[PDB]
Design a protein around this ligand. Structure first.
Ligand SMILES: Nc1ncnc2c1ncn2[C@@H]1O[C@H](COP(=O)(O)OP(=O)(O)OP(=O)(O)O)[C@@H](O)[C@H]1O
Ligand SMILES: Nc1ncnc2c1ncn2[C@@H]1O[C@H](COP(=O)(O)OP(=O)(O)OP(=O)(O)O)[C@@H](O)[C@H]1O
Lengths: 850, 850, 127
């Protein structure tokens, strides 16, 4: 046995690398086939079987390759004596080699046996409703009047009025309503309608337009595009003022084609167009008309209308009907589709069937129209954003998906690929920005800069993403009808709700193909009765985790968890006084979010963060006392872009030299002991090159002496875009020192950041965009035009002490935004400045709470 | 082990040659498949995987074959005792045979397993914009006026006015603007427009022409081509003067089909035709109208004319806007396309996304029209010029590509193939000449003979070439987002930049499939901190380099660098006193450029250049002391065409006999000891048969005795076409002999080449084309018509002493060009000659600086 | 190494049995030597044979003592040092191979040479 064992063991190691490379190349083949098959439309159960099988074989080979490389690195870590001497290593490594050969031959026979896989040169092989009347439209009366108003206002220029939203949001219904208002007839000689959609031809559109202006299109079918444009221009000139309806135009070229047909007769014509692309709407009109959201009562009224015509919904179905109405998120088409499923089912058994879940019920049966309706644009997304989109589907339904969390989740799953001059963080931020541009992913929260802060995936879109991923298996959500498991073995990843986590753990989960663990707290901070054994068994179940993201728990650094070298992105919480060195073995790691409940003032990062080349972002809820890099660790600049909640002690010349590419840096502690010359730890910030954000927080309320912004501070932080001061109690004279930042973009004064009865700024802020003052005790302000020449946003919250916003800021042309939150009499001056700007008729916004 | 080793080693080598030949045949098969695949359009990921795989396998097998032959040559180079005795020889040889056998079986299974490769008889499987008005056309006002002036000028003959330029340059916009001037209507009764493009049918063109002259084309659809020609001629005769606008005509047959329609009514009709082929335009009109280049302000105004139409661009987007405007190189289609990318994106995050790199942003997404716009003519080039073009896509963006550098680079990359009566130099020069003819490759510098000197790839075309090569993998440019490497393993070649070279070395590069090293100095002479260790690392990383081209460095002749026997083309610089014999082992060498910083007056070529049969061109920045060929080296005439910077001592009877086919020879040193009878080194030039260029340079400013050209000099250099004399200090009487060269074509008197207060030439120069005089101390010139009968260019520079250009040169009909750079009062005589020729109305150009 | 590990492990897969057989056969040769010492001898061939049996007996004794010393050294080392040591494995089985060689030498010494055959009572022995 041992003779034979060692014989085959030695024989195999001689092709382990060749077997590895051949398996990897053939798995690349199968992955290319898999992309092809995903693109293809399929209807044969055998084809779904084969796609399932190739996906599972591909992911099995991926696990084998990652295991082999991880073992190789582990061996290289061991000393030469423990390298040669180890015999268990020999057994495991050759068992791994044997598995790799088995899977390689499996891939060889997968390619050879199945004819479908053969390489092909270029071979992938790929109507409205009834029409409502005014009484059938719901809650659009105010919207219709607003849009018609916008249309009718006299303006010699050809102004556009676009309507934009999400798939099946009712836009075409708003246009059809608008299209049949007598007011529109009064204001315009001839209103004509046209539908474009994603697929169209201009000549079709131009011919249909011409039909309205003459019935002899048979004569002009021989005219060219520009001749037709001139003809229609003359026809309109004869007609007079005209409004043209455009249903679902998604391309700028189309708009720029439509401007042509309108003559320059200074009649102030109009074109109102529907577009699922917010950017297209924005170009069409500089101020869009985002289709409102139906309120739950309106949705219930619509469902009543549909599943019972005009006869009232019967009494007992009202409860269930109400339930169905609210759950649809406020988009009419979800109501429409579930009503379709409910047509003529006055028996409450089926109403209860449909209610119990009303997101799955769309995308089923023949009248699934929601699916294809959304797909009308998903295919309008490139593959990179296709995938980055689908991974918005992990977050629980109704969850608020943070911008940074989702950005690092994308970048931690390997979905994004590097570009030739950009950084993965900004490529991903652009991907999500664009995802909102296409209205694909709701965005209701705006950073001071105006960037995404919380994006949600609409209930209908949530179920669409979940089911689409499940079909592609990129991830999945575990469910349990009382008992059972829904085949999680067909789940490349598992998203588990905390409530069912204990039960899923009771079955002793154990998976290898799994490559992440998602368990978010939609009900924030509802940490259930999870024992340490639960966390240990979690560590056991998923050994190949790239993405271990769980924050509603008391996590611990079990030995098993310490072995997870494949780790990429960690979101854990508990009571940790210092990061153990075990984190120094997670070479694959790219991100680390830390939220510790420890009473310790500082967290000691024992793990050598410097050696982790793949590392990109470390986040801590409390200041981190990072060890400086040693001589051995000296090398290339670290990949670290974001380093949040840094202890000032851990800001040394060597650390900042090792993180010169650091972008987002936050430091909290004692400041005066950090601001002096011998406190040049601040002077050490010169090491940071691409630094952009800097949060300064003082943990002491009783300060020995008030610090002073060093004169070098102007250039010490020259690269910083965002700069938040918290509990700094700086003299407003120091605000002048803050006026010498060339690249200052955002400015937050939080918790008496600046101490003083009144603020009289002098230095101009040639680029500042957002001013943010929170809980400022200073009573009067005399900021002038020169101070903030390019003010675009000014936020002052909890200003119970401030007296009046200076009128001088009214002159600022750039300034359009002004929010006063829990502010004193200065609210009156906000009204005065708003009135002045309205008299000047400058686009400006004023928000007052409550 | 040793028994089995030697057994296998002997058995395989018995079969090594058969294995080699069979592998070569099968790799020829895969290369033919690749030639098919490149043409065939494809969109399937699996097929791109297969093409990647066949490319990698083919290049791997090519490396194996070249390594095996190099080893064979090395072994044959060793002595018989050093041949039989060597044991490492057998080890490496039999390992190489094992690798060759492995890759041969790889190719066998690549063919058999994959059905895509089966031989097939004949089986590869292969609209305007909106239209503007005159306010949307930028900066073409003067251009349109110039073109219309060219048009309307009265002339009985049917003169043509063509508009030519690069893809996406806006020609059709100029024509349309021309097509809508009232002036054109005033000067012509009937103006009609026709679109041809690359693909067209005459009958469609003629029928559409006939429509403008009668609405009954339905009647004449049955008439033959000549019948339609006569009909249109009669219609034009009835109409009178006519200008016909032609869009995108590329083939001359079309032009000569258009002359037919026009009647001979001595009405001076006109034809306007746009054409991407500069030669076609030149035929259409003897003086083309190269569409001007939009200035950066015009490009910014245009981009405003789209991303914000007529509403002025907001303030903060101007900075970014200006950046995105100038970067487009001065062609409106780059502006248009990146605008399309920017449509309705007033959030400056995306403006900065697009600005950072504004050449990639074309050729991406749906509205990438730049790509297909260039491809509409890339297929217009045969495969040879197809490839030669793509290797203009390796010089850094904005780099000025020298004519000789690129010519040899082509010929050194294995892209050109020999013809049946031509020499690779002139085939390649013709290829680049055409690459300018088709407007493909910009050309802004002219050699005195009038051939290309510098050529550039327009930023748009540069990125197109880079991406096209990268898809085909013919080469690639290494990039690093902070860290990382972009998979350079899929880069058959690496084009790195000096800025990133140090970091590239930091990763310890090691490649085998790489077959060249491109590192040019766009910022000339910016040699960064590259240590000798860096150069050694270069030598190590790329062992199979055919083309090693790096001059921004301090290169050294390391032992490893001496091994590169596959070497073809060298471009190196440093401090070398004499070329080591190590270069005598580079049997594959074809070219050698040398730029040595040594203070030595002469460089001694220790390497036996005579034995290098593949050698074609040696270049040195200082005179070279070549060793004469020995008796053993005696054989066929050397392939050497160009031999630059030759020490006069290095010009011996035997040397020149061995290089009788030498064409470009340059000699520098002490000359007075060169012209004498016992200095028959001048007489030794009789050996050169196809000598074309001859540059004579004297390094001494204090000459013992004024030299004197030999009487034989006339027939000594009878084959010379170019003859640049520098610092010769010759009496103008000696110039009279210069009229005794039958084949003289170029004449550059540089740095007091001829000494004398005045020049009074007598002998005629029956063929001289371009005269050329730098820094002439002579004061008065008395040349006449007989002296320069066929003068085509007359360039006089730094002639601060020259008094007046003789008026007699005015009579010269051939003379069209004349340039006075930093010239004295003779500039006034230049004005006199210009006025006289203008009075005679002879097509003449005068340039004066400053 | 593959052939090396094969041959070593297969030699061990018995070193104790080879050891004991060699020991008993060397006891045989030692008894023969005790006989031959008493015997008067005058034949150069017999002195050659006695020299040879003495050298073979003492060679086998050196091999046996070396092998037991190596075994004791193994037992001295820690369990980790016992299992992990690879050079020790090579020396162990080289010693075992030498023991097999000497044992075969003793077998052929007995069989080839008649002189060694067992015999009940045969030792042949003026002022
Ligand atoms: N207020 C409403 N009351 C009743 N039904 C409505 C209402 N709004 C929309 N619908 C229904 O929605 C469906 C029409 O959706 P619509 O075409 O307007 O969607 P959309 O968001 O504009 O989509 P797209 O951009 O793909 O055209 C029809 O069933 C129509 O009856
Ligand atoms: N306002 C404008 N100012 C300048 N150029 C414009 C403007 N609007 C469109 N264009 C140019 O018009 C071009 C239309 O194609 P055009 O025929 O003029 O290009 P070309 O390079 O001359 O040759 P080809 O006919 O092969 O396309 C577009 O490339 C765009 O660059």
């Amino acid at each position: 046995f041992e003779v034979e064992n060692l014989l085959q063991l030695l024989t195999d190691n001689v092709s382990a690398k060749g077997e590895l490379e051949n398996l990897l190349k053939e798995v690349q083949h199968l992955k290319g086939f898999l992309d092809d098959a995903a693109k293809l439309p399929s209807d044969s159960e055998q084809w779904k079987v084969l796609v399932e099988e190739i996906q599972k074989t591909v992911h099995t080979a991926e696990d084998a390759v990652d295991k082999f490389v991880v073992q190789a690195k582990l061996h290289k870590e061991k000393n030469k004596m423990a390298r040669i001497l180890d015999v268990g290593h020999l057994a495991t490594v050759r068992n791994l080699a044997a598995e790799v050969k088995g899977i390689h031959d499996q891939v060889k026979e997968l390619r050879l046996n199945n004819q479908a896989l053969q390489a092909r040169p270029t071979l992938e092989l790929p109507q409205q409703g009834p029409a409502l009347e005014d009484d059938e439209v719901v809650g659009f009366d105010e919207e219709a009047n607003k849009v018609i108003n916008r249309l009718v206002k006299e303006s010699k220029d050809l102004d556009i009025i676009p309507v934009v939203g999400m798939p099946g949001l009712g836009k075409t219904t708003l246009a059809r309503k608008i299209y049949k208002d007598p007011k529109l007839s009064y204001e315009f000689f001839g209103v004509h309608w046209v539908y474009v959609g994603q697929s169209y031809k201009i000549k079709d559109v131009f011919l249909n337009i011409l039909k309205f202006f003459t019935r002899r299109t048979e004569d002009y079918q021989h005219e060219d595009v520009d001749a037709l444009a001139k003809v229609i221009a003359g026809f309109i000139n004869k007609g007079g003022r005209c409004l043209i309806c455009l249903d679902d135009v998604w391309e700028t070229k189309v708009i720029d084609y439509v401007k042509t047909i309108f003559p320059e007769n200074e009649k102030g014509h109009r074109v109102m167009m529907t577009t699922r692309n917010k950017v297209l709407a924005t170009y069409a009109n500089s101020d869009p008309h985002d289709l409102k959201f139906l309120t739950p009562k309106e949705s219930f009224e619509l469902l009543v209308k549909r599943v019972f015509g005009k006869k009232p919904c019967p009494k007992d179905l009202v409860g269930h009907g109400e339930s169905i109405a609210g759950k649809c998120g406020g988009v009419p088409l979800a109501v429409v589709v579930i009503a379709g499923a409910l047509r003529g089912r006055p028996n409450t058994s089926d109403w209860i069937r449909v209610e119990r879940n009303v997101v799955q019920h769309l995308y089923t049966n023949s009248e699934e129209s929601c699916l294809k309706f959304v797909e009308m644009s998903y295919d309008h997304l490139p593959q990179e954003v296709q995938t980055c989109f689908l991974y918005c589907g992990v977050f629980p339904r109704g969850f608020d998906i943070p911008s940074w969390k989702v950005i690092r989740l994308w970048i931690a799953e390997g979905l994004i690929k590097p570009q030739e001059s950009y950084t993965l963080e900004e490529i991903a931020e652009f991907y999500l920005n664009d995802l909102v541009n296409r209205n694909l992913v709701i965005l209701q929260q705006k950073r001071s800069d105006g960037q995404i802060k919380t994006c949600r995936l609409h209930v209908m879109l949530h179920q669409f993403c979940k089911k689409e991923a499940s079909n592609k298996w990129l991830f999945q959500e575990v469910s349990l009808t009382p008992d059972q498991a829904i085949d999680p073995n067909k789940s490349r990843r598992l998203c588990i709700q905390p409530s069912n986590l204990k039960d899923f753990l009771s079955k002793k989960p154990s998976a290898e193909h799994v490559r992440s663990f998602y368990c978010f707290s939609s009900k924030e901070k509802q940490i259930r009765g999870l024992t340490p054994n639960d966390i240990k068994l979690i560590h056991k179940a998923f050994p190949l985790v790239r993405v271990l993201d769980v924050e509603s728990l008391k996590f611990l650094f079990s030995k098993d968890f310490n072995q997870l070298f494949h780790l990429r992105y960690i979101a854990i919480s508990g009571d940790f006084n210092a990061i153990p060195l075990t984190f120094g073995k997670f070479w694959n790691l790219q991100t680390l979010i830390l939220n510790t409940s420890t009473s310790e003032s500082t967290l000691d990062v024992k793990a050598d963060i410097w050696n982790m080349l793949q590392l990109r972002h470390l986040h801590t809820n409390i200041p981190a006392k990072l060890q400086p890099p040693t001589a051995t660790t000296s090398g290339k600049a670290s990949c670290l872009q974001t380093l949040c909640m840094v202890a000032p002690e851990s800001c040394e010349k060597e650390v900042l030299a090792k993180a010169c590419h650091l972008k987002k840096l936050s430091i909290r502690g004692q400041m005066a002991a950090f601001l002096g010359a011998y406190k040049g730890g601040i002077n050490n910030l010169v090491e940071l090159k691409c630094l952009e954000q800097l949060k300064l927080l003082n943990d002491v309320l009783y300060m020995n002496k008030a610090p002073h912004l060093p004169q070098t501070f102007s250039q010490l932080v020259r690269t910083v875009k965002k700069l938040t001061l918290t509990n700094t109690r700086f003299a407003w004279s120091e605000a002048d020192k803050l006026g010498q930042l060339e690249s200052l973009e955002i400015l937050k004064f939080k918790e008496n950041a600046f101490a003083g009865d009144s603020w009289k700024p002098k230095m101009g802020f040639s680029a500042l965009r957002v001013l943010w003052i929170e809980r400022a005790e200073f009573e009067t302000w005399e900021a002038s035009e020169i101070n903030f020449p390019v003010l675009r946003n000014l936020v002052l919250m909890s200003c119970d002490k401030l007296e009046t916003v200076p009128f001088e800021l009214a002159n600022l042309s750039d300034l359009y935004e002004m929010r006063l939150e829990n502010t004193s009499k200065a609210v009156k001056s906000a009204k005065a400045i708003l009135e002045s700007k309205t008299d000047k008729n400058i686009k400006f916004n004023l928000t007052i709470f409550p």
